Structure 1
Amino acid sequence: ENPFFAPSALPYGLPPFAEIREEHYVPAFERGMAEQLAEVEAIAGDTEAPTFDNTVAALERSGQVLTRVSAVFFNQSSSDTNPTVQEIQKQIIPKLTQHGDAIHLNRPLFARIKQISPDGLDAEQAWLLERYVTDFVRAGAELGAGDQERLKALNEELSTLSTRFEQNLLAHTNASAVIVDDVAQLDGLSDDSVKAAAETAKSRGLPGKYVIPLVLPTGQPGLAELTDRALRERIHRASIQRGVPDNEELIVRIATLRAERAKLLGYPTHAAYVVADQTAPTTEAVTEMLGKLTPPAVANAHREADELREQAGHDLEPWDWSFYAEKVLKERYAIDGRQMRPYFELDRVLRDGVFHAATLLYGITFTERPDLVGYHPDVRVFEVFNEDGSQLGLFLGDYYARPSKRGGAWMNSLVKQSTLEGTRPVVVNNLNIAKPPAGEPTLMTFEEVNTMFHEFGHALHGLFSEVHYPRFSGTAVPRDFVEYPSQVNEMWAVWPSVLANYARHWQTGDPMPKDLLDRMLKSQKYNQGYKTVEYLAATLLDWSWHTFQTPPENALTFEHEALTTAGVDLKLVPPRYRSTYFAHIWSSGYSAGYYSYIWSEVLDADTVDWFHENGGLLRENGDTFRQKLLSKGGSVDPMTAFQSFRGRTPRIEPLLDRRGLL
């Protein structure tokens, strides 16, 4: 038989991972699609009069097997893939695209949905009806049949190309991991990092050597510490050449097809299509916001580059920025990255930082379940409870890098909350921390600590969902709003009373001295020029790919020209991703939406101020934020929810202050 054919019997609907094997995926996708096609055909050809229940709610009820297999398959394809999963991906993704289009371009189905009036529907039901009409129109339901035929071909080619991009990038990233034969070449690297690099070598079939895998962004952590400048350059070059050449012609084709598709649907650019379902009102509002931020950010980067040139005594290459920045921090603040690492051990950060903050703010509590079975042996499963002891959901944490896991960090849901189905949320976080050898502590950079709080913010958004319909569950909000709950949860990593609770030495338990912890906090306002410019460069790169007049001939030439035109081609500050490894825009859902992070950050920064205005870290304030915003999913207009919470529309001044942009 097949474990996807029945609902999970496990707690919270945790999928039965012990019973699931790769041979189950294809037959469950095939059944899932067949059973959902039949359900839709029954709705579309229903002889009874069209109602919200027998049309819109009926579609929400459909696709249960497909939902189940999809939840597990896409979780594995991100977190723990293998050649077999990647072959299944090649076969199934085109079928799923054609499947979605078979439903959205069903003419009698759409005519049915259009016959439903709002009369007598509660707020969420009327909102779902509008959302369904929008989803269908955005998928081509109002196009003529010739145009529908071309759109089907466009969509299938796009999904295939995006799949090829991700597989290319995983293969090349893994193969570009930097191998070091002589430990002398790791001079400067903390002892625990040397040990992790030997463990990585052992795990990847090179015992006795040291391996430094690449992280997703351009900037590689090791450059902060490594004194061997030739190795810093070799690592930097391995980073920036990811996707070269094999992803070049691929992303040109993706961008070209996105433009063709957007025009087919009535939009001049892909970005105009994307922005039409974003909280940002127009493409003009996006370019205007960015145009205000970019000039001050670049001026900051120039001032910072002068400081590093003075420190170094000489001119710099991109592979020297982090290294001299660390020297400046040690000199100015007495903060040495190697001496900070011992205060940030994974277990303590998790228990006494991430969970702790959530308990003080929201009253929720956590029980680790080492007896429940995750999808990989290193996954930690946690049961989550409300303050009153009632069951809330499950949280799965998967913290370490491995060759089967794509770069970066992300949240996803195995089970979405809805009262329609009576399901509880089951949410996952994946990070890419280097795994220590047996017995050794997992010491973290503060960037990794921040990432842990960011992903947990997405987790809480998922866990606090109290919606009726699964279309609106948890994180189902526009991309330029979804990065608000994640970014605002980062406030707790640096809230001093929380930071003081977890920043304790891994061996002794001793808190960091109060005046050093003060300066570690100060040292994070440092380098806002670099940090802001690398982000804005990538944002403007994304924008250029999805707003061109004429299509590009050459990917690398296009990138250069885009960055020069936008005034952010800085030798010392490359974009945070270059085109050929910009996974956010070519294989995930952030095309013409990398700006989402800074757009959402307005709301984050303004919300930090709300907490200070209302007495800080108090249970009452957590209940308000949860009730008014985090529990809503997509079930209400996000900006109205923000306004009801904040007391007014957003102010940008707090973001500007944070990033030094006034």
Structure 2
Amino acid sequence: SDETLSSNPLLQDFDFPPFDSVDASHVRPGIRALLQHLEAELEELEKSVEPTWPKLVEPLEKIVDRLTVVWGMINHLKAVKDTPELRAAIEDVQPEKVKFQLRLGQSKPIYNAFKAIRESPDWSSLSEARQRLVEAQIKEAVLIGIALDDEKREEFNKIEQELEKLSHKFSENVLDATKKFEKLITDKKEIEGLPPSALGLFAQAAVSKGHENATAENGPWIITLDAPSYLPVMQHAKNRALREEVYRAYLSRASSGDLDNTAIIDQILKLRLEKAKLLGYNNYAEVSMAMKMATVEKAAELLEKLRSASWDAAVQDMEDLKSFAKNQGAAESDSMTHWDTTFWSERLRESKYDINEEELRPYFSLPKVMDGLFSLAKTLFGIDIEPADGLAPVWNNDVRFYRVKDSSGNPIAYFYFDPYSRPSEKRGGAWMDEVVSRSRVMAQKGSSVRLPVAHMVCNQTPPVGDKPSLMTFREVETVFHEFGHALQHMLTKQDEGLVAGIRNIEWDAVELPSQFMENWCYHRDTLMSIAKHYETGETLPEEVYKKLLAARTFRAGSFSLRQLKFASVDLELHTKYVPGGPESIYDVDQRVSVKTQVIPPLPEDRFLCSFSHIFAGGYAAGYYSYKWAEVLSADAFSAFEDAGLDDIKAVKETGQRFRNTILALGGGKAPLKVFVEFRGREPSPEPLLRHNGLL
């Protein structure tokens, strides 16, 4: 009670979202008031509409922007600060929000004005960015069913409504399943082989479930399914029965009982196919491809090319594991299973390259990783990044906030970073999200542009007691990856808000700058700038750097095949699979797996039930987007190799070109063209193969 509706934080004008003052109780009133105001604005827009920027595109952006920013902030809070009250609130307003998105998207007065712009006799004189914007709006309106008669339209809107609901449900079941599993270890024997770091984590966990005397050394241990817990078990637990139990629990998350995602998946695929037919396509993959660089055929070709290049290496990887385990006298070497792979891969990796993950950890502290990352961004792209904590409200005390400046000391962008695993309330994985776009229209009166703001979110090993977060090499690459996305959002030079940043970039190109950044983790100057012992300040020894380098291509065939399995199963489920029939999604999984993994999945494998990328994310008939863009990213990196990675002048010159093409142009130019503008030619898959030793 107590406060006026008009004082609701979601309804105020703000520079940075009020992330510290918004909670579940604000959502129904704020969102319902907002939608009433936006309906009225849309009516005014339709009434005055003309095929010009001031009468069409500017008032449209003002409507889309407000919805995107406010809904975006609520969805962000659901992903990092989930509560039952926030879920119920979002579920109660989500249909009204979707209804409004459909109303807006299906506006005939807006659509007809965009067609009149496209049909103008001097179209060729309109700027490329504005051409891209108009073409995108026309194509998007058709994809949201504007061409359908009123009865088919009704059916389309009902499908859209149900898909939004199922996707939210899918992600809640995954969070809930990951949260639910807790394994209390009391007998020190069962945990044999877990390193100190993991021990320190499962004991810190132990405390907050009761058992308050618990220590790393001795006191009891709770094992969970979030990655920083699950992975060390699979890499290190000498107890094979514990590996098998943790594996089977991980593999069956959200696949039975109240959290089952199976029927949700079945319903999602059914509806996706109905939608495709309403729009005149054969299957949903064709719908997905309408907005992508690829076609189903071209995507399939690339996957099959990479698969062919990876297969013999993957077979040899399996034989190498068997040989190694057998030479250790391990009884399971005669019948290696999925719960042995990670474990023996890590033993092999240790023996073959003489590197121990646990001993590397002191050299990879988050504060030093961030310092080195920012120093690299300065070198490549000319920007200065500094902490600005206090400037923007945040949702948790671990959240960092930074200001990005150009060479003259002028702010050009900001970002938040929420770095640590928090499985009680925070979605798994790692991602980047937009907060606000760079926009001329949304600028304050008297200033030329609203500066862009991004989110970076990771789920890395938390700090243990008082020390900083100590990371694995994989966690470092993940930070670089998400930073790559943030840079494309933040460094954009488009002021046309609807094509700025990452907007309107064909989805199979959005993984270009993120994967590109990961290459620099192996660049000597970059790695050495980061790798300072957290207590001691001593730089990582040269010979250790050399072993890290040698280990880069370890099991590249198997890692490649794993990604190709994910991409192929996605494509297959959205092309040939017909839901409702005798064949289950798990049968599809088995069939596709015959050519994309060296041994079959267990019959009890339910990895699909956690595959949020394609059931609660932007990658439906799109998971291949990672590999498609990795070809581009690898080849982009080879431009630096060509120029000379040992020549700081050449590195800065090439970096500036990258900054002024891939990072600057947003979706205001076709991605193949932006790439050619940077590279000097069309892309080749040779760099990607060479980098991973798969030529």
| Whole-angstrom CA distance in 2 between matches of 1:216 and 1:37 | 43
Q: After superposing the two structures, state which structure 1 stretch, 174-183 or 605-614, moved more.
A: 174-183
Q: Secondary structure at the match of 1:417?
A: coil
Residue in structure 2 matched with residue 423 of structure 1 by the alignment: 450
Corresponding residue for 1:124? Answer: 129
Distance 1:574 1:284, change over 3 A: farther
In structure 1, the residue corresponding to 2:457 is in which secondary structure?
strand
User: How far 1:556 moved relative to its partner?
Assistant: 5.0
SS of structure 1 residue aligned to 2:222: strand
The answer to whether the aligner puts 1:460 opposite 2:465 as a matched pair is no
Q: How does 1:389-538 map to 2 (within 5 A)?
A: 389-402=409-422, 403-421=424-442, 422-476=449-503, 477-538=505-566
Identity of aligned residues (%): 31
Secondary structure at the counterpart of residue 319 of structure 1: helix
Give the letter for the 2:254 counterpart. G
The question of 1:657 aligning with 2:684 is answered no
Residue 43 of structure 1 pairs with residue 45 of structure 2: yes
RMSD: 2.3
* Aligned-partner Cα distance in 1 for 2:685–2:604: 24
Matched residue, 1:23: 25
- Matched residue type, 1:26: R
Q: Which residue of 1 aligns with 2:625?
A: 596
One-letter amino acid of the counterpart of residue 552, structure 2: Q
Tell me, in whole angstroms, the C-alpha distance in 2 between the residues paired with 1:586 and 1:217.
24
Structure 1, 323-332 or 180-189: larger mean CA deviation: 180-189
Letter in 2 for 1:466: K
Cα distance in 1, alignment partners of residues 75 and 324 from structure 2? 47
Range with greater deviation from structure 2 (610-619 or 225-234): 610-619
Say which SS state the counterpart of residue 101 (structure 1) adopts: helix
Structure 1 residues 296 and 625, CA, compared in 2 at 3 Å: closer, same or farther? closer
- The alignment of Structure 1 onto Structure 2 pairs a total of residues equal to 655
Q: Distance in 2 between matches of 1:178 and 1:361?
A: 46
Q: Post-superposition shift, 1:554? A: 6.0
Residues 596-635 of structure 1 mapped to structure 2, 5 A cutoff: 596-616=625-645, 618-635=651-668
Once the two structures are superposed, the pairs formed by residues 526-605 of structure 1 within 5 Å of their partners are 526-551=554-579, 552-553=581-582, 555=584, 557-564=586-593, 566-568=595-597, 570-571=599-600, 578-605=607-634
The residue that corresponds to 2:330 in the other structure is none
Whether the 8 Å CA contact 2:569–2:592 is kept in 1: the answer is: yes
* Counterpart amino acid of residue 436 in structure 2: V
In structure 1, give the amino acid aligned to 2:9: P
Q: What amino acid maps onto 2:613 in structure 1?
A: H
Where does residue 283 of structure 1 map in the other structure? 296
Structure 1 residues 236 and 622: alpha-carbon distance in aligned structure 2, compared to 1, 3 A threshold: same
Alignment of 1:245-394 (within 5 A): 245=256, 246-280=260-294, 282-313=295-326, 314-315=333-334, 316-351=336-371, 353-372=372-391, 373-394=393-414
How has the CA–CA distance of structure 1 residues 348 and 289 changed in structure 2, closer, same or farther, with 3 Å as cutoff?
A: same
1:192 aligns with 2:201: no
Higher mean alpha-carbon deviation, 443-452 vs 411-420, is at 411-420
Kept in 2: contact 1:345–1:442 (CA 8 A): yes
SS at structure 1 position matched to 2:661 = helix
Q: Which runs of 4+ in 1 moved over 4 A?
A: 204-207, 216-219, 552-556, 564-567, 572-577
For the 8 Å contact 1:269–1:546, the answer to whether it is kept is yes
Q: Aligned partners of 1:100 and 1:218: how far apart in 2?
A: 40
Q: State the 1:220 CA deviation.
A: 2.9
Residues 11-90 of structure 1: pairs in structure 2 closer than 5 A:
13-46=15-48, 49-90=50-91
TM-score normalised by the chain length of structure 1: 0.94
Query: What residue in structure 2 maps to residue 138 of structure 1?
Result: 143
Instruction: Quote the offset at 1:434 in angstroms.
Output: 2.5
Query: What secondary structure, in the 3-state scheme, does the structure 2 residue paired with 1:115 have?
Result: helix
- Measure, in 2, the Cα distance between the counterparts of 1:556 and 1:603: 31
Question: What does residue 239 of structure 2 align with?
Answer: 228
Q: Where do residues 141-180 of structure 1 align in structure 2 (5 Å cutoff)?
A: 141-180=146-185
One-letter identity of the residue aligned with 1:300: A
TM superposition shift of 1:507: 2.0
Residue 105 of structure 2 corresponds to: 104
Task: Please say which of residues 123-132 and 147-156 is displaced more in the overlay.
Answer: 123-132
Distance in 1, matches of 2:267 and 2:36, equals 31
Residue of structure 2 in register with 1:202 after alignment: 207
The letter for the 2-side match of 1:407 is G
Q: Can you list the C-alpha shifts for 1:193-225, whole angstroms capped at 9, x where unaligned?
A: 211122223345564342333246998343112
Within the candidate set 2, 9, 12, 2:8 is matched to: 2
Q: Is the 8 A contact 1:397 1:429 kept in 2?
A: yes
AA at the equivalent of 1:560: D
Q: What's the CA shift for 1:357? A: 1.1
> 1:491 Cα shift?
1.4
Deviation at 1:585, TM superposition (A): 0.4
Residue by residue over 1:529-558, the C-alpha shift from the partner in whole angstroms, topping out at 9 and shown as x without a partner, is 221111111111111111125325564533
**Unaligned stretches of 5+ in structure 2?**
1-6, 215-219, 327-332, 443-448
Question: Among residues 248, 262, 267, which one is paired with 1:237 in the alignment?
Answer: 248
Q: 1:575 to 1:488 in 2, by over 3 A?
A: farther
* Contact 1:189–1:226 (Cα < 8 Å) also in 2: yes
Range with bigger deviation, 551-560 or 54-63: 551-560
Q: Structure 1 residues 218 and 114 mapped into 2: Cα distance closer, same or farther (>3 Å)?
A: farther
Q: Distance in 2 between matches of 1:206 and 1:610?
A: 55
Deviations 1:99-122 (A, max 9, x none): 111112233332333233443533
Distance (Å, rounded) in 2 between the aligned partners of 1:592 and 1:206: 46
Partner of 2:329: none
Say if 1:284 and 1:573 are closer, same or farther in 2 by CA, change over 3 A.
farther
Deviation per CA, 1:355-378: give whole Å up to 9, x if none: 121122122122213334312111
Deviates more, 1:197-206 or 1:640-649: 197-206
Instruction: Report SS of the residue matched to 2:494.
Output: coil
